[PDB]
Structure formats: structure tokens, C-alpha cells
Design an enzyme around this catalytic site. Structure first.
Site, PDB file in Angstrom:
ATOM      1  N   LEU A 188       0.833  -1.194   0.000  1.00  0.00           N
ATOM      2  CA  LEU A 188       0.000   0.000   0.000  1.00  0.00           C
ATOM      3  C   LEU A 188       0.870   1.248   0.000  1.00  0.00           C
ATOM      4  O   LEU A 188       1.927   1.282   0.638  1.00  0.00           O
ATOM      5  CB  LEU A 188      -0.917   0.018   1.224  1.00  0.00           C
ATOM      6  CG  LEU A 188      -1.927  -1.127   1.304  1.00  0.00           C
ATOM      7  CD1 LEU A 188      -2.661  -1.076   2.628  1.00  0.00           C
ATOM      8  CD2 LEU A 188      -2.909  -1.077   0.140  1.00  0.00           C
ATOM      9  N   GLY A 189       0.411   2.276  -0.715  1.00  0.00           N
ATOM     10  CA  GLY A 189       1.162   3.506  -0.826  1.00  0.00           C
ATOM     11  C   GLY A 189       2.400   3.299  -1.687  1.00  0.00           C
ATOM     12  O   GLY A 189       2.509   2.341  -2.457  1.00  0.00           O
ATOM     13  N   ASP A 190       3.348   4.224  -1.545  1.00  0.00           N
ATOM     14  CA  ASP A 190       4.629   4.126  -2.232  1.00  0.00           C
ATOM     15  C   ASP A 190       5.772   3.744  -1.301  1.00  0.00           C
ATOM     16  O   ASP A 190       6.924   3.700  -1.743  1.00  0.00           O
ATOM     17  CB  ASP A 190       4.950   5.439  -2.958  1.00  0.00           C
ATOM     18  N   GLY A 191       5.487   3.471  -0.028  1.00  0.00           N
ATOM     19  CA  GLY A 191       6.490   2.946   0.878  1.00  0.00           C
ATOM     20  C   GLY A 191       7.569   3.923   1.285  1.00  0.00           C
ATOM     21  O   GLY A 191       8.654   3.494   1.687  1.00  0.00           O
ATOM     22  N   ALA A 192       7.301   5.228   1.207  1.00  0.00           N
ATOM     23  CA  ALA A 192       8.333   6.214   1.517  1.00  0.00           C
ATOM     24  C   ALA A 192       8.738   6.174   2.986  1.00  0.00           C
ATOM     25  O   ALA A 192       9.890   6.482   3.315  1.00  0.00           O
ATOM     26  CB  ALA A 192       7.851   7.613   1.137  1.00  0.00           C
TER      27      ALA A 192
ATOM     28  N   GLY B 129       8.314   3.358   4.971  1.00  0.00           N
ATOM     29  CA  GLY B 129       8.353   1.973   5.393  1.00  0.00           C
ATOM     30  C   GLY B 129       7.304   1.140   4.689  1.00  0.00           C
ATOM     31  O   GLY B 129       6.337   1.676   4.139  1.00  0.00           O
ATOM     32  N   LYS B 130       7.485  -0.176   4.708  1.00  0.00           N
ATOM     33  CA  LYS B 130       6.588  -1.085   4.008  1.00  0.00           C
ATOM     34  C   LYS B 130       5.289  -1.238   4.790  1.00  0.00           C
ATOM     35  O   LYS B 130       5.302  -1.604   5.969  1.00  0.00           O
ATOM     36  CB  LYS B 130       7.260  -2.445   3.843  1.00  0.00           C
ATOM     37  CG  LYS B 130       8.442  -2.445   2.887  1.00  0.00           C
ATOM     38  CD  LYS B 130       7.988  -2.381   1.438  1.00  0.00           C
ATOM     39  N   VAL B 131       4.172  -0.949   4.133  1.00  0.00           N
ATOM     40  CA  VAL B 131       2.843  -1.288   4.625  1.00  0.00           C
ATOM     41  C   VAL B 131       2.213  -2.205   3.589  1.00  0.00           C
ATOM     42  O   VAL B 131       2.143  -1.855   2.407  1.00  0.00           O
ATOM     43  CB  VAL B 131       1.981  -0.031   4.845  1.00  0.00           C
ATOM     44  CG1 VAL B 131       0.566  -0.409   5.279  1.00  0.00           C
ATOM     45  CG2 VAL B 131       2.625   0.878   5.880  1.00  0.00           C
TER      46      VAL B 131
ATOM     47  N   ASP C 269       1.486  16.165  12.004  1.00  0.00           N
ATOM     48  CA  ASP C 269       1.822  15.941  10.602  1.00  0.00           C
ATOM     49  C   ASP C 269       0.555  15.882   9.760  1.00  0.00           C
ATOM     50  O   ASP C 269       0.436  15.054   8.851  1.00  0.00           O
ATOM     51  CB  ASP C 269       2.654  14.670  10.414  1.00  0.00           C
ATOM     52  CG  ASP C 269       3.436  14.663   9.102  1.00  0.00           C
ATOM     53  OD1 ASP C 269       3.588  15.735   8.480  1.00  0.00           O
ATOM     54  OD2 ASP C 269       3.906  13.578   8.691  1.00  0.00           O
TER      55      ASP C 269
HETATM   56  O1  B6E Z   1      -1.918   6.031  11.806  1.00  0.00           O
HETATM   57  C1  B6E Z   1      -1.003   5.357  12.265  1.00  0.00           C
HETATM   58  N1  B6E Z   1      -0.509   4.230  11.674  1.00  0.00           N
HETATM   59  C2  B6E Z   1      -0.909   3.659  10.446  1.00  0.00           C
HETATM   60  C3  B6E Z   1      -0.129   2.622   9.956  1.00  0.00           C
HETATM   61  C4  B6E Z   1      -0.400   2.067   8.721  1.00  0.00           C
HETATM   62  C5  B6E Z   1      -1.454   2.547   7.966  1.00  0.00           C
HETATM   63  O2  B6E Z   1      -1.602   1.965   6.709  1.00  0.00           O
HETATM   64  C6  B6E Z   1      -2.819   2.001   6.040  1.00  0.00           C
HETATM   65  C7  B6E Z   1      -4.018   1.749   6.700  1.00  0.00           C
HETATM   66  C8  B6E Z   1      -5.206   1.733   5.995  1.00  0.00           C
HETATM   67  C9  B6E Z   1      -5.159   1.975   4.629  1.00  0.00           C
HETATM   68  N2  B6E Z   1      -6.137   2.037   3.665  1.00  0.00           N
HETATM   69  C10 B6E Z   1      -5.527   2.257   2.475  1.00  0.00           C
HETATM   70  N3  B6E Z   1      -6.166   2.291   1.264  1.00  0.00           N
HETATM   71  C11 B6E Z   1      -5.525   2.420   0.061  1.00  0.00           C
HETATM   72  O3  B6E Z   1      -4.303   2.512  -0.042  1.00  0.00           O
HETATM   73  C12 B6E Z   1      -6.391   2.423  -1.131  1.00  0.00           C
HETATM   74  C13 B6E Z   1      -6.098   2.545  -2.442  1.00  0.00           C
HETATM   75  C14 B6E Z   1      -7.330   2.441  -3.143  1.00  0.00           C
HETATM   76  C15 B6E Z   1      -8.278   2.265  -2.229  1.00  0.00           C
HETATM   77  O4  B6E Z   1      -7.737   2.249  -0.966  1.00  0.00           O
HETATM   78  N4  B6E Z   1      -4.218   2.385   2.600  1.00  0.00           N
HETATM   79  C16 B6E Z   1      -3.961   2.214   3.962  1.00  0.00           C
HETATM   80  C17 B6E Z   1      -2.767   2.239   4.674  1.00  0.00           C
HETATM   81  C18 B6E Z   1      -2.246   3.579   8.449  1.00  0.00           C
HETATM   82  C19 B6E Z   1      -1.971   4.134   9.685  1.00  0.00           C
HETATM   83  N5  B6E Z   1      -0.252   5.738  13.338  1.00  0.00           N
HETATM   84  C20 B6E Z   1      -0.537   6.801  14.216  1.00  0.00           C
HETATM   85  C21 B6E Z   1      -1.733   7.513  14.219  1.00  0.00           C
HETATM   86  C22 B6E Z   1      -1.927   8.555  15.119  1.00  0.00           C
HETATM   87  C23 B6E Z   1      -3.218   9.301  15.115  1.00  0.00           C
HETATM   88  F1  B6E Z   1      -4.195   8.628  15.712  1.00  0.00           F
HETATM   89  F2  B6E Z   1      -3.137  10.465  15.729  1.00  0.00           F
HETATM   90  F3  B6E Z   1      -3.649   9.560  13.894  1.00  0.00           F
HETATM   91  C24 B6E Z   1      -0.919   8.892  16.016  1.00  0.00           C
HETATM   92  C25 B6E Z   1       0.265   8.179  16.039  1.00  0.00           C
HETATM   93  C26 B6E Z   1       0.423   7.145  15.151  1.00  0.00           C
HETATM   94  F4  B6E Z   1       1.581   6.452  15.137  1.00  0.00           F
END
Ligand code: B6E
Ligand code: B6E
EC number: 2.7.11.1
Lengths: 295, 286
Positions: A20-24, A26-28, A135
Site C-alpha cells: 500500500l502507498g509508495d512505501g516512503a 516503510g513497508k505497509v 503531521d
Molecule cells: O496512523 C497510524 N498508523 C498507520 C499505519 C499504517 C497505515 O496503513 C494504512 C491503513 C489503511 C489503509 N487504507 C488504504 N487504502 C488504500 O491505499 C487504497 C487505495 C485504493 C483504495 O484504498 N491504505 C492504507 C494504509 C495507516 C496508519 N499511526 C498513528 C496515528 C496517530 C493518530 F491517531 F493520531 F492519527 C498517532 C500516532 C500514530 F503512530
């Protein structure tokens, strides 16, 4: 390691089906539930030491307590075979920056109004818990098909996670302290810390209206000088936008944090105070999804 | 930190300076023993940062780490005893500030120490006369007594800023984007200037106000100057005017200030050696 399962193999539940994403940052990975077909994001981190595991687990601590409709939803976490898996509910509408790229346009004002209302709800929630985001930008605004946001914080370093939970108070003895230390540290560990996000929200609204943030032509070091020296940004073509939108920006993009309003105060501003339906944003997502069905 | 040895087999506690005065059972050498009762191993890790800092700070004008132990849940940090005590006590005992030649030696040596610290990316952040220990030879040993476990890490290294530049609020730009650069070292230069006024006048500027109130005064006021300017050389007053620049970006570094004529021709610590002897002789009267 209270919210981390060491006894469950995540590969029993989840199949990696892509990235997911472009991995800038880290890998998700995109993960598919082997039983149901439900989708999740899997943030997988190779650590190998209980010490470093402690630092990464701060992200799990934050996500576990940030149970709010407009924050990304933690599904669970595993530590297995030397890897920390952080599972987050997949957001099938994608990120707002990706939507603007896919549709080759910015958001309409009604679409921005939904994002702004929901971002304010999320920020009021976070700040109430003394959590700051620091951010905010369209790339951290994920979308569901119902037209609701899920706020993410993709790009913060693991070492800086603890700062989002709690700020350190000033170092020094007052009589001897330098003026920049007084200015920059004596308001830390107070709601002063929450005001930065309000400014970043304002910039995010301009980004969504215009695709790019202000001063986007400059490199990332040069823009810091531009922010310090310039009056607050405004919308490029005022006549395209309501007086309420322009006034919201004028109040949020206050260079003085002491007079910049809180998220709770901004929920009463007429730009968002009557926003009770997400339908404009639901339609944006529907359009982006329909364009993907072409690919 | 050594874990296999009981420090009490090496050091006898002979008094208190919780910091004890200790005597080496083999040599009779005198040291300070900072003993911290820690509850767990993770707690032992935070406090060890002070040892890391002291171990890298081998400079002549910084307190000298002799060794460290962890035993029976207590971390022992052994530091060479400084028989001249701290400068604040000297002024209390003699009921007077330092003379200009005495301030010149302290200033020169503090600048050398700060230049050294900043070259290792260490910042002090609590400079004051009470942190300037003295030897009988008239040399300083810079200490940092008041640091907390949480703050030790910050003295060692500052975190990079959080955020993406284009979206960052002006106060974050102003206060965070220069962290983890030599901008961090400038605060100590201001504190050095205040310490020089403290040594000239016994008390720092704004001393009549309470500690929270002085934070407001520092923000609101022009930089402090010496109360009776005619008593002090043009060079001293100019050094202070240059160091006590409210703008850190135009404030000079320690290396730059070492070129200033207030300190650049100082070659002997005799003035301070005499001060230490005078202070000890007064203590005998008390
Ligand atoms: O927010 C995170 N972590 C985190 C880690 C990985 C992550 O990966 C995701 C999750 C769901 C996705 N859905 C999609 N969908 C599509 O690409 C897509 C393409 C076409 C259709 O759909 N891509 C995603 C990537 C998302 C979030 N951390 C964090 C948050 C907060 C907060 F609370 F204040 F916000 C504070 C501190 C923190 F550390
Ligand atoms: O500096 C320390 N620690 C520390 C811990 C304990 C300590 O106790 C001492 C040591 C020697 C003494 N000699 C005396 N003498 C008399 O009472 C006295 C009375 C009549 C005559 O004589 N009292 C002493 C107290 C001194 C220092 N830390 C530290 C330093 C730095 C640095 F590098 F940037 F400066 C950075 C970070 C740090 F954490």
C-alpha cells in the site's frame, strides 16, 4: 506488550496480497483475511530485540486508545518470528491526496467542509487525551466508501512517537534561562502544544482546494524561511470560495498560537457548524472508485 | 556500570555533600558518591545516561568520573572530589562577588569547557555559579547537578523535528526546525552571560522575583547589564552585551567568544587559586 499477541501466528489469519502507498516511510502491506476476504493494512516491522520492540509498541498504545470514528482502527497486533505486525482496518476510499491525483482536481467546497468537520472532531478527541498529531496533510486523510475520514499518522518516526503522547517540560533554572528556551519550552506540556495542529489543518484545507500546499514550489528547507517571513496563506482565487471558508482559514492560520482557536471552538464556526451529512465526500469517493474500475 | 563488585568494598562513606563524600579504602583519595536507589533494570538504564555523558567528557574543566557501580539496587556514580567547593558558596562565605580578574579565569575556563561539550553535541542547559566546582589549583570543574533522568537524554542528543515543512505552524518552525543542529548550543552562551553577572553581583538579574515570575521578565525585558557599569572594564561589559543577545542566531558561539579580549589573553589561573584559599580561610572562621 499488553496489546501484542505473542502466541498467534498472523499468517494463519492474513495473506499478503500487495503493498500500500509508495512505501516512503516503510513497508505497509495489503492483507486479505484468509477466511472472510476482509482487507487490512499490515505494518510489519523487523526488530529482533525486546528493547526496540518497546519503542515501536508506542504506536500500538496510541492506536489502541484512539478509538474514535475518524481515526484509523487498530484491528490487532502480533509479535511472531521476529516481526511486529500492526493490523489496521483497510480504508477502501484511499487517501485524499491519491484521490486528487486520480481525478486530476482538487476538492469542492462541500467536500472540504466534510473533511474539515471530521478532522476537527478527530483533533478535539486527540487533544482531549493530550495527544497531538503534528503531521496533518491530505496524505494522512484516508477515506471509507461511506464518505468518512480515517485520520492516520504515517510518517512520524518511532523515536518521536512518545512526544505525541506527552511533551517534556522546560530544562533549566529560570533566572539563567535563555529567551529562546523560555519562548519555546515553558508552554510545553500545556494545551499550547495542541495549537500547531490547528494551523496544519488550515494548510490541509488549502491543499485540498488547490491540490498543493502554499509555497509548494520551494524545496523543503527553503519553505521554512517562507513560513516564518510570510503573512498567513490565503486561497488563490477568493471568489471561487465562500466567505465562511475564507474566514475559517483566516482564523485557523493565525501565526500567534495563543490566539489561534481550539478544535472545539472551530466546531462552532459557520464553515462546519451545520455539516451533519458526509454525502458530498461520499460522492467524491464514489467518483474515484468508478475511475479505478476503469483500470 | 560495574555489576560484579560491592562499592562498599572500595569506598568508605565519610560524610554527605543524595551525594556522599567517600574515601577510597586503598588510596585515601576523596570522591563524591552520587547514589541513586533504582527500582528496576529499566530504571538503571535511564540513569546510566549520566555515566555515558561523564565518560565522554574527559576535559580538564569538567567534573571527573572515577567509576560507576550497580549493586543492591543502587547505582553509584563516583566523581573526583573538588576541594574548593562551588562558586556560589564562595560568594556566600565572603559576602562579595568575584573580582574582574577572578571572573576572567572562570569565564575563560567555562568557555573552554562549553566549546568542548558543544563539540561532542552535549548541551548543559543549567549553567550557574552553583554548578562551577573548584580545585585548589584554581581550576573549575563544571558540573550539572540538577538534571533529571528524562532530561539526561536531551542533553546528549536532541530529537529531529516532527512534521512536514509545508504544513508546519510558525511556532513549530521557530522552535523545532533548528533542533539537532548547533542552534541548540546557543542557550548555554546566554546562561554563561547570566552566570558572569551572578558572579559579579552574587545574585542573577531579576533575583527579587519568584522563579515563575522571572520567566515573564526574561521574555519582556532587554538583556541585563551590570548594575554599576563603571566598576567593570569596557571589555567585560562588551563581552556581556555580545553574549546576552536575545536572538540565538546572532549570539556567538563559545569558540567565537574565546577570541574576545575579555578572555583571549588570560594565561594564568592565579586569581582563582587565591580566591579558593581566601574562601577556605573564611570558612575556618564560621
Ligand atoms: O496512523 C497510524 N498508523 C498507520 C499505519 C499504517 C497505515 O496503513 C494504512 C491503513 C489503511 C489503509 N487504507 C488504504 N487504502 C488504500 O491505499 C487504497 C487505495 C485504493 C483504495 O484504498 N491504505 C492504507 C494504509 C495507516 C496508519 N499511526 C498513528 C496515528 C496517530 C493518530 F491517531 F493520531 F492519527 C498517532 C500516532 C500514530 F503512530
Ligand atoms: O555533573 C554531573 N554529575 C555530578 C554528580 C555529582 C556531583 O557531586 C559532587 C562532585 C564533586 C564535589 N566536590 C564537592 N566539594 C564540596 O562539596 C566542598 C565543600 C567544601 C569544599 O568542597 N562537592 C561535590 C559534589 C557532581 C557532578 N552530571 C552531568 C554533567 C554534565 C556536564 F559535563 F556537562 F557538566 C552533563 C550532564 C550531567 F548529568
Amino acid at each position: 506488550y499488553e496489546h501484542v499477541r505473542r502466541d498467534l501466528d498472523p499468517n494463519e489469519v492474513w495473506e499478503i496480497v500487495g503493498e500500500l502507498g509508495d512505501g516512503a516511510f516503510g513497508k505497509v502491506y495489503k492483507a486479505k483475511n484468509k477466511e472472510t476476504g476482509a482487507l487490512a493494512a499490515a505494518k510489519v516491522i523487523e526488530t529482533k530485540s525486546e528493547e526496540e520492540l518497546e519503542d515501536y509498541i508506542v504506536e500500538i498504545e496510541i492506536l489502541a486508545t484512539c478509538d474514535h470514528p475518524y481515526i484509523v482502527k487498530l484491528l490487532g497486533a502480533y509479535y511472531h518470528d521476529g516481526k511486529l505486525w500492526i493490523m489496521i482496518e483497510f480504508c477502501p476510499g484511499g487517501a485524499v491526496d491519491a484521490i486528487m491525483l486520480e481525478l486530476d482536481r482538487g476538492l469542492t467546497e462541500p467536500q472540504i467542509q466534510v473533511v474539515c468537520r471530521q478532522m476537527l472532531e478527530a483533533l478535539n478527541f486527540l487533544h482531549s487525551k493530550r495527544i497531538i498529531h503534528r503531521d496533518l496533510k491530505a496524505g494522512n486523510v484516508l477515506m471509507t466508501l461511506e464518505g468518512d475520514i480515517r485520520l492516520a499518522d504515517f510518517g512520524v518516526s518511532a523515536k518521536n512517537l512518545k512526544t505525541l503522547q506527552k511533551r517534556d517540560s522546560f530544562i533549566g533554572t529560570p533566572y539563567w534561562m535563555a529567551p529562546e528556551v523560555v519562548m519555546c519550552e515553558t508552554m510545553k506540556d500545556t494545551p499550547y502544544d495542541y495549537k500547531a495542529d490547528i494551523w496544519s489543518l488550515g494548510i490541509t484545507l488549502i491543499e485540498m482546494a488547490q491540490i498543493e500546499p502554499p509555497h509548494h514550489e520551494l524545496n523543503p528547507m527553503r519553505v521554512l524561511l517562507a513560513i516564518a517571513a510570510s503573512d498567513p496563506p490565503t486561497l488563490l482565487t477568493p471568489s471561487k470560495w465562500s466567505v465562511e471558508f475564507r474566514d475559517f482559514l483566516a482564523i485557523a492560520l493565525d501565526k500567534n498560537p495563543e490566539t489561534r482557536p481550539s478544535a472545539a471552538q472551530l466546531l462552532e464556526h459557520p464553515f462546519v457548524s451545520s455539516i451533519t451529512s458526509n454525502k458530498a465526500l461520499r460522492e467524491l469517493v464514489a467518483e474515484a472508485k468508478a475511475e479505478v474500475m476503469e483500470e
